[PDB]
Design an enzyme around this catalytic site. Sequence first.
Site, PDB file in Angstrom:
ATOM      1  CG  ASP A  39      -1.825   1.189   1.309  1.00 33.26           C
ATOM      2  OD1 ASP A  39      -1.942   1.915   0.298  1.00 33.26           O
ATOM      3  OD2 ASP A  39      -2.434   1.390   2.397  1.00 33.26           O
ATOM      4  CB  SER A  75      -2.085  14.321 -13.524  1.00 37.67           C
ATOM      5  OG  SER A  75      -2.503  14.116 -14.860  1.00 37.67           O
TER       6      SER A  75
END
Length: 330
Positions: free
Chosen positions: A35, A199
């Site tokens: 994770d 992004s």
Amino acid sequence: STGSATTTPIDSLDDAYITPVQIGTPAQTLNLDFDTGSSDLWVFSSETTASEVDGQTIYTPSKSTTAKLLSGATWSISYGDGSSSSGDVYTDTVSVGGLTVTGQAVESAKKVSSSFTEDSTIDGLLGLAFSTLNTVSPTQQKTFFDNAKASLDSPVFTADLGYHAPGTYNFGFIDTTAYTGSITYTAVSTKQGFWEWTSTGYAVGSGTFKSTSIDGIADTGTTLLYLPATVVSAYWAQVSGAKSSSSVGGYVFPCSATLPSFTFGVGSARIVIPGDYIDFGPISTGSSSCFGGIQSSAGIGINIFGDVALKAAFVVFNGATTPTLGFASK
């Protein structure tokens, strides 16, 4: 040193991925959920409340000649999906794909919430975010990657998740045969303890690319892709019959649909998520309403590049003095 381990979807939807991990002497092998969105290595154990264990493999520290109680240390964690666990702490030897760390904090669960009990395939979590998020008190503990970093050939790990198929986690090296083209690296902020990046925009299907900054986290522990409501609305508007259902808890779409792809930007480069990756199947057995793999982040507080996005790429978690992320197509 290096390590290399195969990671395998837990079910036919890729709801999560499990990677075998060796703990203790002699080795006890548990299947853990790696994770990159948390920083605790915790396991079902001989100390876990018996009614809360249902099929998991447990770590038994008393059977490990290298286990030592970390005196006074406790831990307690709550995840973004509302699940939780807590317990005490041992140090022991932990190996992943041939890479061994001695003295790793292994957090032994005394209590787990229902969603962990109900998932017999996941024996614990291995956190790979930054150690500043580790929950051990009163002495915070380091992640497996942080402990191994100095010994690694290069201070990196990579995630190569498969679509409906096994993939690989590598530590200490970049397998240049595992991706196509070049790797595009992008800046990381560690201020929230996550692999947080920005992004450069998105496209829906064959549509034109929208340049817009989207701050989010690279999180192998989250199944879906969570993005701002404007972006998610633009995606689902291209699917006839798709709608946001408050009763189901997100966007659903007719199972008869063919989904468009979704592209996200990494610098000047582009990662394309095929439409099939966005199908999470019937909302309930036999239903013709299917659950979408792209969902709004509006109720989270952060955008999450979860498995839906990450499994479309080869992803480099660069733990150099100034950390960065790298993405390649594959």
